């Protein structure tokens, strides 16, 4: 169906369609579908355009969504770099931000394990 810009696959429940979005996750899928009035079980194929408009308005007005989550996460990231914070320095060196393991783990940040000579 039509949404903010993240596809809702043909064989994913409505909460399951939402969970793919960066803006909406499984728990937020349940929350949004309860607030708007769409079943967490019904498919994307069973979706109605009026419900699409209502859902889009609700998520863009009351939830941090793809654009809102970007303008939050990345803007405050560069905010903590620009204050010189070591959360920013964890960001710069490709480290987990909360000071957890960077020595060997934290591959999603620094990048996968590799091999030097």
């Amino acid at each position: 169906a039509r949404l903010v810009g993240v596809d809702l696959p043909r064989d994913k429940r409505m909460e399951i369609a939402l969970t793919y979005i960066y803006g909406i996750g499984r728990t937020r899928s349940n929350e949004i579908l309860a607030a708007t009035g769409i079943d967490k079980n019904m498919r994307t194929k069973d979706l109605t355009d009026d419900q699409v408009t209502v859902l889009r308005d609700y998520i863009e007005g009351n939830l941090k969504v793809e654009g809102d989550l970007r303008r939050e996460v990345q803007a405050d990231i560069r905010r903590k770099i620009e204050i010189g914070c070591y959360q920013g320095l964890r960001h710069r060196r490709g480290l987990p931000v909360r000071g957890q393991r960077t020595k060997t783990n934290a591959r999603t940040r620094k990048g996968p394990k590799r091999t030097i000579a």
Binding site: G111, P112, K113, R114, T115, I116, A117
Partner: peptide
């Protein structure tokens, strides 16, 4: 640039 994952040899 940052020293990305070095592949195998």
């Amino acid at each position: 640039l940052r020293p990305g994952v070095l592949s195998p040899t």
